[PDB]
């Protein structure tokens, strides 16, 4: 069985510098790319920044400075050099697919207290019936062409990917959730709605670029009953 487990998460004052952890299972950090993700409790989802198989970094351009990744041949590493009070978040590590760079193994993420393309996600909350139909559309600054990819997130849970590519859907996920978009207009949407579909969706570029990897600010969606 394949999997991703993060440690190092504390509370810290600031200006304490802290390292985290990233322990992978079942695969060789020698053959996947591993990428860094944070959320703040109650925002949304914000890419750190990713090394390659090959050791190949690449921050986003906010992170520079702030953060420093490394690895081991089991371990992928985060530091962040001075923390404030705005680092205050769970911190995730997440396992890149091969075609883009989006993730398809997330691992349950790590608490750290301490004492340029922008993306456009619409509606920011929408409730419909069992049974109902929610549209959620998602609007990229400049083109990124197929390089989309869809997240499931249940409350204090780490996110599943659903589509990757725009429109190709993830094993497991049922045909319910169909994708459809290209270069700066995409949607997503959930037919015959369930119980199980209560959580916050998230769009990502998963464009090949540090400046161009960006994720949606996030659509709760409900179920009316």
């Known amino acids: 069985a394949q999997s991703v487990e993060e440690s190092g998460g504390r509370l810290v004052t600031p200006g304490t510098p802290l390292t985290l952890a990233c322990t992978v299972s079942?695969?060789?950090?020698?053959?996947?790319?591993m990428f860094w993700v944070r959320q703040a409790p109650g925002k949304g989802l914000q890419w750190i920044g990713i090394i390659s198989n090959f050791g190949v970094i690449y921050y986003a351009t906010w992170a520079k400075g702030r953060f420093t990744i490394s690895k081991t041949s089991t371990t992928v590493d985060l530091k962040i050099t001075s923390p404030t009070t705005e680092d205050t978040a769970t911190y995730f590590c997440?396992?890149?697919?091969?075609?883009?760079?989006?993730?398809?193994?997330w691992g349950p993420g790590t608490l750290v207290t301490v004492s340029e393309l922008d993306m456009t996600q619409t509606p920011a909350s929408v409730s419909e019936p069992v049974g109902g139909t929610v549209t959620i559309k998602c609007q990229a600054s400049?083109?990124?062409?197929?390089?989309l990819a869809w997240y499931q997130q249940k409350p204090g849970q780490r996110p599943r990917l659903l589509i990757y590519?725009?429109?190709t859907l993830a094993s497991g996920v049922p045909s319910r959730f169909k994708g459809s978009g290209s270069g700066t207009e995409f949607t997503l949407t959930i037919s015959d709605l369930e119980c199980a579909d209560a959580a916050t969706y998230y769009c990502?570029?998963?464009?090949?670029?540090?400046?161009?990897?960006?994720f949606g600010g996030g659509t709760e969606v409900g179920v009316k009953s």
């Open positions: 400049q083109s990124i062409s197929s390089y």
């Open positions: 079942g695969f060789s950090l020698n053959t996947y790319s």
């Open positions: 997440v396992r890149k697919y091969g075609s883009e760079w989006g993730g398809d193994l």
């Open positions: 590519e725009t429109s």
């Open positions: 990502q570029s998963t464009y090949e670029n540090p400046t161009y990897v960006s």
